[PDB]
Design a binder for this molecule. Structure first.
Ligand code: BCL
Ligand code: BCL
Ligand code: BCL
Ligand code: BCL
Ligand code: BCL
Ligand SMILES: CC[C@H]1c2cc3[nH]c4c(c3C)C(=O)[C@H](C(=O)OC)c4c3nc(cc4[nH]c(cc(n2)[C@@H]1C)c(C(C)=O)c4C)[C@@H](C)[C@@H]3CCC(=O)OC/C=C(\C)CCC[C@H](C)CCC[C@H](C)CCCC(C)C
Ligand SMILES: CC[C@H]1c2cc3[nH]c4c(c3C)C(=O)[C@H](C(=O)OC)c4c3nc(cc4[nH]c(cc(n2)[C@@H]1C)c(C(C)=O)c4C)[C@@H](C)[C@@H]3CCC(=O)OC/C=C(\C)CCC[C@H](C)CCC[C@H](C)CCCC(C)C
Ligand SMILES: CC(C)=CCC/C(C)=C/CC/C(C)=C\CC/C(C)=C\CC/C(C)=C/CC/C(C)=C/CC/C(C)=C/CC/C(C)=C/CC1=C(C)C(=O)c2ccccc2C1=O
Ligand SMILES: COC1=C(OC)C(=O)C(C/C=C(\C)CC/C=C(\C)CC/C=C(\C)CC/C=C(\C)CC/C=C(\C)CC/C=C(\C)CC/C=C(\C)CCC=C(C)C)=C(C)C1=O
Ligand SMILES: COC(C)(C)C/C=C/C(C)=C/C=C/C(C)=C/C=C/C(C)=C/C=C\C=C(C)\C=C\C=C(C)\C=C\C=C(C)\C=C\CC(C)(C)OC
Ligand SMILES: [Fe+3]
Ligand SMILES: [Sr+2]
Ligand SMILES: [Sr+2]
Ligand SMILES: [Sr+2]
Ligand SMILES: [Sr+2]
Ligand SMILES: [Sr+2]
Ligand SMILES: [Sr+2]
Ligand SMILES: [Sr+2]
Ligand SMILES: [Sr+2]
Lengths: 258, 60, 40, 280, 318, 60, 60, 40, 60, 40, 60, 60, 40
């Protein structure tokens, strides 16, 4: 008998092996996925006083340690993070309801204005010099031939009003580029950072538009504990404020449209 | 049982936890592979009609 | 979960009766459906 | 439930439509007015694919009816119907499921939009999503329209749609010669390359050899500069990859848009314009 | 309105960077940098320096040899008419040894240039492999690239060398030409009864589509959180910022779950390596194990049936 | 006390303006749908030739 | 269900707004679904020629 | 939801008038449709 | 068993709400599903022509 | 589960009779269905 | 059939500009939709030619 | 033997709240799985035409 | 872990009979299944 066709061929079983390796892969990737934000926030946890820490399937992976270079530290993941109050109040007492920011929305530090507490230290070059520093601290840097020098352009907010003028340019000493625009504010001549991401140029006019906030809001830009360098804490703090204006800076960004 | 004697010192070099799990995996796998090798050869024992054919227990 | 034990009293009444109204129009519609065209 | 840092952002407002009406969360998903339109479009779409599977091409008791996942398939009406609505059990169903799919993808896109307005982030993602929505539309709306009949659309079935691709592909004899096809394929392959390179990199620096600390930007640039004399840099690599994948989708959309409506002959024949230039 | 971080609108220069320093043994670096205002319009404007060791030189060497055999051969097929070479270039190619020869080393005029170009190409790709592992070690980094390159090398090897040796015939490897290698692809599917019904080729297709999906999604994300320096992924990985937060949340609020600045790079990594690895497996079973995938799909009941509305009588059966 | 005497109170749970907008949207969508549905069956009123065929009013 | 007089207490457990929207959507789609299913079978009420032929009220 | 119990009598009053106006308009269109073309 | 319980303690273990919503969603799903399963077999109740055939009850 | 020992008696109390309600309508529909059209 | 008209108040709740463009857009789209529906059906005016089909003015 | 000295405390190692959910989901999924598997073979219990064929043998 | 030694006795006790309640429903159904429809 030389014809007993087997119903099982290498192609079936290779498709079997694959799916098994697959499932293990998926599972694993979802585990690396819980090295942050976990366990979750329910009132399942609060109701039970915490006896239901929310982690789901799969579960959380044993911590991993990152050894920052330069006497920098050591970070772990997953970690235990201290809760932080919410600077807002429930739009409804029902769960899943959004919260309204407390007080003046741009000040709230809630919503598009919220942000975490990153180190109060500076990111560093390879050598260990403050990575992000101004061109005034980073002597070498230079505009690229054929690019308007931002230095001296007028910074202008979302409504038209002048905001200030570019007093300097902050650069990456690691990957040479403009990261932050410095702004001598008109209303008080204080110096603030302006993330490049929020800034549009109008080279033919030497203006630097900013849809984010109004010219006035530039007065409240979060500040630097040193005008010649900036910490991780301070960057988030700077940007999130402008970001808040995307939903706050006007009595209309709140939406609807209809 | 090394078989003599300072070949224990090998676990002074290669993490015992890692070596163990490694072997567990390697075997748990190899078993599946060779099983499949046997399933496609003369040593196959399932789609053989051994010792009496089962799809000819009725018709299909 | 937004409500008190007393407001979970209030919501429930109107909820139950309107659901019953819906069910009324539906059952009615079904009896109507049954005369003009038996399906079972 | 929320991430351990989520409550602080779960602000009110940012809609386009609905306002406080549907301005709430469910588990981790954001609802919004478009989550509701979306869920409705989606649910009816799927529930109808279930009914099509239930009835089969010749009726629920015939042998072509089936619930096997590889083979369930809902196909367009014949070409004889043109752009008219065709009877339900003759491809009508397929038309409605399509309307639902287009509406669901568009709702999904608009809901990602409200989510950008809430979180205050750029809207690069739903714009990028809209490229897939576009490709889907050419494959069901634009081409079959330009072609005077909705039947030119692909059927919704796992392998049967593969068959659609196959025979449509073969009407032009050697599809590989479609030049836009050549582009799109180039981007799909290169995209897959940069992604493997970025992926590999981030993971190679944040987790270096034991005995070494998280690596640096300087390392990053130095490695790919070491290997290939150039490093596009961190920001931009994220920019490129977005370019490649969106373009890959683009050229797929154009390569199929020209296969029919603007070209009927075999595709290798297209390359004739090159053998006949007055240079040779 | 808002900058999209597509085009660096205002650049800055600084003296070029020779890079983080390599240990003893890792040779000097060569070439001295330049800047392209235009690469600069979209990315690091610095061009080079480059590293070249024994490895790098032996790889550039083999690789260019292989490029010459293929090219010179193509000029020969048009009679040394560089014009005609230019005219039909896309259609030119260097075909493989004929089957008549099996796996024997063939005469120059009958395929031997292909075996030599295939040989030299492979050695040069695998030398570039070693190159990236060396360049990756000099930096204390890990071999994640090398595990991927090794996967793509896997597919390559399966295509032009492994399947051929297994099938006992150099004529089964792919020929070097644009249109020729496209034709090789189509004929390959045809010869084995339509490759669409090959499960592995379906998975490889889900994974290619997935590399486009993930990189487009992630990439769009990083740009959308570029405003918060999300591109600076390394520190968002060590010290989570509102970029990584807004990022993880956009998706969380959208599709119900999410990843992290470190993990997305693993989903993406694993999705790409998977393409090539299903892909190679896919070519491995063709002819070696399965000869007609459509039939295979019927045997496993996966091919759909449609009402037979058009049909043709079989002359072979008259 | 019965009901339909405190069912105005519904706008204390559902914001009135938006409820209008949603209703209108539903009306548009349901409208096109129903039209297409009717057009999808025999009661169609366009490809019917009313009162005289127009596809044969282009050749004779 | 909760049919034991204390079945109001369910709203300390299930949010009225969210449950409301769910009921609404589920009902609307359910309606459309069932409608098309019936329109898709012999119980069709459109493609019947009711009460007198309409395609012989225009064509031929 | 920024309404008083009295600003929910009013909106409701005009809403009801308008919706019944719409349904009325509908019943009219349904009569023309029914006269020229009975569907049952 | 004539045993409607032992200990009702389960709601000290499983969130009453979660089980609630889950039962509702899953049941609606199982319902639609099985409905579909039955409509696809001989046990079909729509395309049966019940109680007398309808597409051949009037002109055609 | 942040509920008291008394309201897990209660929840259980109303829940069981409820599930029993569902089961009732279920057995009803199934016997009626077996009567009109047997399947086994 | 109640008593308050005064339905001008509608623009105190609904933004006029956006409503304006919304109606504008919807009207152009509904326009295209309808045009494509009739042109694809019997009431067609293009695929006819008055008083004679024009490419059948010459057969040659 | 085979007598299990203490299968209590098993809930001191494995969180029960989790364990139940594990079992429930696993059983519903396995249930559907086995159901469909039996539905796909000869052991089918639906498409049998019980007790009289319903299509074209069922009154109509 | 997050139980006392007394409530895993209590939990296990309630658990086992509950499980067997399930096993009972199953062997019963399989008995029914075996009677109408023997398979081997
Ligand atoms: C030829 C094959 C026979 C067959 C023989 C059998 C046999 C034999 C068996 C069944 C059994 C089942 N059959 Mg049968 N069955 C057939 C025909 C059918 C048909 C049909 C369309 O004709 C249907 C609908 C069914 C249906 C079913 C189910 C009623 C039942 C399995 C329940 C289950 O999964 O347990 C799931 C298990 C649990 C413990 C879940 C309990 C529910 C909990 C509460 C889950 C609810 C969701 C939960 C609350 C979520 C919790 C919240 C989260 C924790 C967050 N059978 C044919 C006739 N059938 C089984 C049975 O009878 O039950 C014993 C069984 O052993
Ligand atoms: C048949 C033989 C011909 C051929 C015929 C065709 C034809 C014909 C076509 C292609 C198409 C394409 N081919 Mg081809 N093709 C050939 C060989 C190849 C080869 C190769 C190595 O040989 C490759 C790499 C490709 C690859 C490609 C791409 C260039 C392109 C598909 C991408 C795309 O459509 O994006 C588009 C992506 C989408 C449309 C997805 C959109 C997503 C939507 C909005 C949402 C989906 C939601 C859904 C609900 C998700 C499910 C989730 C559930 C909710 C859980 N072809 C062969 C030689 N090829 C197709 C194309 O051009 O694209 C239009 C096309 O029409
Ligand atoms: C798996 C299927 C078949 C096949 C399937 C397809 C399909 C389908 C297509 C291609 C196409 C192409 N294939 Mg292929 N291809 C095969 C295997 C190969 C191999 C190889 C040695 O294994 C090579 C070198 C190539 C090369 C090429 C690229 C030249 C091109 C698309 C660019 C891309 O994705 O770039 C990503 C990588 C880079 C950017 C790195 C650097 C590129 C190097 C230097 C390219 C060398 C060759 C070059 C063409 C010669 C001079 C330049 C010309 C002016 C263009 N293929 C496999 C065996 N290939 C696409 C096309 O349209 O062109 C025919 C296309 O449609
Ligand atoms: C022709 C019609 C057939 C077809 C036949 C094939 C065949 C045959 C193959 C594919 C292959 C694949 N097909 Mg196909 N394919 C079809 C239609 C499609 C469709 C579609 C929409 O219809 C899609 C999306 C695809 C998709 C794909 C990709 C998913 C996959 C290969 C990924 C890849 O790039 O590997 C390419 C990447 C590499 C080869 C590695 C590159 C690295 C090398 C080493 C680079 C060296 C560079 C060099 C040294 C630089 C110097 C240049 C020198 C001059 C050479 N096919 C139809 C059914 N398809 C593969 C497959 O499935 O096999 C099972 C394959 O080989
Ligand atoms: C030959 C087959 C018979 C048939 C045999 C059966 C059998 C047998 C059964 C059904 C049952 C069902 N059938 Mg049937 N059925 C047939 C034809 C149909 C057709 C049709 C178009 O022809 C339809 C629409 C239906 C429809 C239905 C549903 C009404 C019902 C179960 C719904 C469900 O699962 O909900 C999911 C359930 C819930 C979500 C829970 C109930 C809802 C809430 C929780 C109750 C209110 C609680 C309280 C007020 C608190 C407030 C809470 C808020 C509501 C949130 N059948 C054919 C003719 N049908 C099943 C049934 O009757 O269910 C008892 C059943 O046993
Ligand atoms: C355009 C470049 C690439 C891209 C980008 C892209 N896709 C995206 C996004 C982006 C940026 C999103 O943000 C969005 C997303 O949510 O991320 C996953 C999305 C998305 N990418 C997905 C699909 C997808 N994208 C694909 C590809 C691409 N998308 C390109 C590779 C592909 C393919 C073919 O390769 C697919 C299958 C979705 C998971 C998701 C959008 C999900 C969504 O819109 O959900 C709402 C709709 C439903 C849940 C279903 C509606 C119900 C329908 C009525 C029934 C289905 C009908 C369907 C037409 C039948 C087809 C059957 C098939 C078996 C043939
Ligand atoms: C996840 C799988 C994806 C993948 C991954 C992948 N590819 C890779 C890698 C990885 C991980 C590498 O590590 C490696 C790389 O270097 O990445 C940038 C590579 C690679 N991907 C490339 C190609 C490639 N990969 C492809 C596909 C894919 N690879 C998949 C999409 C494709 C396809 C199918 O489209 C291509 C074309 C190469 C650039 C590179 C391997 C380069 C190599 O092996 O070099 C061999 C030899 C030469 C290049 C010869 C040198 C010729 C010089 C360019 C000329 C310089 C001359 C100089 C003037 C000197 C003077 C000369 C003297 C002799 C006179
Ligand atoms: C009756 C009635 C009411 C019905 C009941 C309703 C029912 C049935 C309830 C069931 C509910 C459940 C179970 C689910 C709901 C289902 C929904 C709506 C559908 C899911 C749709 C959805 C989009 C699924 C797609 C799944 C997949 C695999 C998508 C592909 C995308 C991808 C590969 C996923 C993983 C990777 C992800 C998520 C990356 C995102 C991501 C990226 C890209 C970053 O770059 C980044 C950077 C820094 C930090 C974080 C991130 C980050 O999270
Ligand atoms: C830390 O991050 C990282 C870095 O930073 C340090 C790196 O440097 C690196 C190293 C990376 C590199 C050195 C990058 C190398 C780049 C590679 C290999 C990609 C290859 C691409 C090419 C050769 C270019 C091919 C394209 C062209 C020549 C231009 C084509 C122009 C065309 C087709 C016409 C233009 C029009 C269209 C395409 C149609 C419309 C387009 C769209 C709709 C797309 C939209 C795009 C956007 C961006 C919004 C990595 C991996 C990294 O991860
Ligand atoms: C005029 O031109 C001058 C500059 C001279 C040169 C110009 C050159 C040009 C333009 C060349 C152009 C070349 C092109 C465009 C080539 C394109 C090639 C393509 C697209 C190829 C596609 C696929 C090819 C594949 C997959 C080939 C695989 C071959 C393999 C894997 C061969 C392996 C062989 C080995 C390892 C040999 C082993 C030999 C042993 C040791 C076994 O012998 C005993
Ligand atoms: Fe990235
Ligand atoms: Sr048997
Ligand atoms: Sr059937
Ligand atoms: Sr000529
Ligand atoms: Sr008519
Ligand atoms: Sr019947
Ligand atoms: Sr009828
Ligand atoms: Sr006409
Ligand atoms: Sr004319």
């Amino acid at each position: 008998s030389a014809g007993i066709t087997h119903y099982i061929d290498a192609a079936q079983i290779t498709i079997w092996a694959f799916w098994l390796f697959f499932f293990g892969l998926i599972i694993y990737l979802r585990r690396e996925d819980k090295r942050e934000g976990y366990p979750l926030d329910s009132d399942r946890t609060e109701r039970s006083g915490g006896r239901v820490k929310v982690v789901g399937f799969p579960d959380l992976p044993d911590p991993k340690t990152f050894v920052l270079p330069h006497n920098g530290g050591t970070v772990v993941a997953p970690r235990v993070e201290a809760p932080v109050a919410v600077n807002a109040t429930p739009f409804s007492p029902a769960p899943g309801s959004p919260l309204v920011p407390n007080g003046d929305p741009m000040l709230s530090g809630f919503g598009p204005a919220a942000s975490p507490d990153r180190p109060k230290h500076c990111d560093l070059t390879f050598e260990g010099l403050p990575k992000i520093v101004p061109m005034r601290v980073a002597k070498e840097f230079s505009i690229a031939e054929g690019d308007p020098d931002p230095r001296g352009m007028t910074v202008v907010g979302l409504d038209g009003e002048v905001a200030g003028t570019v007093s300097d340019v902050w650069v990456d000493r690691s990957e040479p580029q403009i990261r932050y625009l410095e702004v001598e504010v008109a209303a008080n001549k204080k110096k603030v950072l302006l993330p490049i991401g929020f800034s549009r140029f109008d080279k033919k006019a030497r203006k630097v538009k900013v849809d984010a906030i109004k010219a006035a809001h530039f007065a409240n830009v979060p500040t630097l504990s040193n005008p010649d360098q900036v910490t991780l804490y301070e960057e988030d703090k700077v940007c999130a404020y402008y970001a808040g204006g995307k939903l706050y800076a006007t009595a209309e960004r709140a939406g609807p449209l209809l | 049982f090394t078989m003599n004697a300072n070949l224990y010192k090998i676990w002074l070099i290669l993490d015992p936890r890692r070596v163990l799990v490694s072997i567990v995996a390697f075997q748990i796998v190899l078993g599946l592979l060779i099983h499949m090798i046997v399933l496609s050869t003369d040593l196959n024992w399932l789609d053989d009609n051994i010792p009496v054919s089962y799809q000819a227990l009725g018709k299909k | 979960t937004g409500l008190t034990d007393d407001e979970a009293k209030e919501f429930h009444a109107i909820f139950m009766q309107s659901m019953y109204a819906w069910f009324g129009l539906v059952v009615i519609a079904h009896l109507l459906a049954w005369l003009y065209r038996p399906w079972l | 439930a929320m991430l351990s840092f989520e409550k602080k952002y779960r602000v009110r407002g940012g809609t386009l439509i609905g306002g406080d009406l549907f301005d709430f969360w469910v588990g981790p998903f954001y609802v919004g007015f478009f989550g509701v339109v979306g869920f409705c479009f989606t649910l009816l779409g799927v529930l109808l694919i279930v009914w099509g599977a239930t009835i089969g091409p010749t009726g629920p008791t015939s042998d072509l009816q089936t619930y096997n996942l590889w083979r369930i398939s809902i196909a367009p009406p014949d070409l004889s119907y043109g752009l008219r609505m065709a009877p339900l059990t003759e491809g009508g169903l397929w038309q409605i499921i399509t309307i639902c799919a287009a509406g669901a993808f568009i709702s999904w896109a608009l809901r990602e939009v409200e989510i950008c307005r809430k979180l205050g982030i750029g809207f690069h993602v739903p714009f990028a999503f809209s490229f897939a929505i576009g490709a889907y539309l050419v494959l069901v709306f634009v081409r079959p329209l330009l072609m005077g009949a909705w039947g030119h659309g692909f059927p919704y079935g796992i392998l049967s749609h593969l068959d659609w691709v196959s025979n449509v592909g073969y009407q032009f004899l050697h599809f590989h010669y479609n030049p836009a096809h050549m582009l799109a394929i180039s981007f799909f392959f290169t995209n897959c390359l940069a992604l493997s390179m970025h992926g590999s990199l981030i993971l190679s620096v944040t987790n270096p050899q034991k005995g070494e600390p998280v690596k640096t930007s300087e390392h990053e640039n130095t490695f790919f500069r070491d290997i290939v004399g150039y490093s596009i840099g961190a920001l931009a690599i994220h920019r490129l990859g977005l370019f490649l994948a969106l373009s890959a989708a683009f050229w797929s959309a154009v390569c199929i848009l020209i296969s029919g409506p603007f070209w009927t002959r075999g595709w290798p024949e297209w390359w004739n314009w090159w053998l006949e230039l007055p240079l040779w | 309105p808002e900058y999209q971080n597509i085009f660096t609108a205002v650049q800055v220069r600084a003296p070029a960077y020779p890079g983080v320093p390599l240990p003893k043994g890792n040779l000097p670096r060569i070439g001295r940098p330049i800047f392209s205002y235009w690469l600069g319009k979209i990315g690091d404007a610095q061009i080079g320096p480059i590293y070249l060791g024994l490895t790098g030189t032996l790889s550039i060497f083999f690789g260019l040899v292989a490029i010459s055999i293929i090219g010179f051969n193509m000029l020969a097929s048009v009679h040394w008419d560089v014009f005609q070479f230019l005219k039909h270039f896309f259609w030119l190619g260097l075909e493989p040894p004929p089957p008549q020869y099996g796996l024997r080393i063939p005469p120059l005029s009958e395929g031997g240039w292909w075996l030599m170009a295939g040989l030299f190409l492979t050695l040069s790709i695998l030398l570039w492999w070693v190159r990236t592992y060396k360049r990756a070690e000099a930096l204390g980094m890990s071999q994640h690239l090398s595990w991927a390159f090794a996967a793509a090398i896997f597919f390559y090897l399966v295509l032009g060398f492994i399947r051929p040796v297994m099938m006992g015939s150099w004529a089964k490897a792919v020929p070097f030409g644009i249109f020729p290698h496209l034709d090789w692809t189509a004929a390959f599917s045809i010869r084995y009864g339509n490759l669409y019904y090959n499960p592995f080729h379906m998975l490889s297709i889900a994974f290619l589509y997935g590399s486009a999906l993930l990189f487009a999604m992630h990439g769009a994300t990083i740009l959308s959180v570029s405003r918060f320096g999300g591109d600076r992924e390394i520190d968002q990985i060590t010290h989570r910022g509102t970029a990584a937060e807004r990022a993880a949340l956009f998706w969380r609020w959208t599709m119900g779950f999410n990843v992290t600045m470190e993990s997305i790079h693993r989903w993406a990594w694993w999705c790409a390596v998977l393409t090539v690895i299903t892909a190679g497996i896919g070519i491995l079973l063709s002819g070696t194990v399965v000869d007609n995938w459509y039939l295979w799909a019927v045997k496993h009941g996966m091919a759909p049936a449609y009402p037979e509305v058009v049909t043709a009588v079989n002359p072979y059966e008259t």
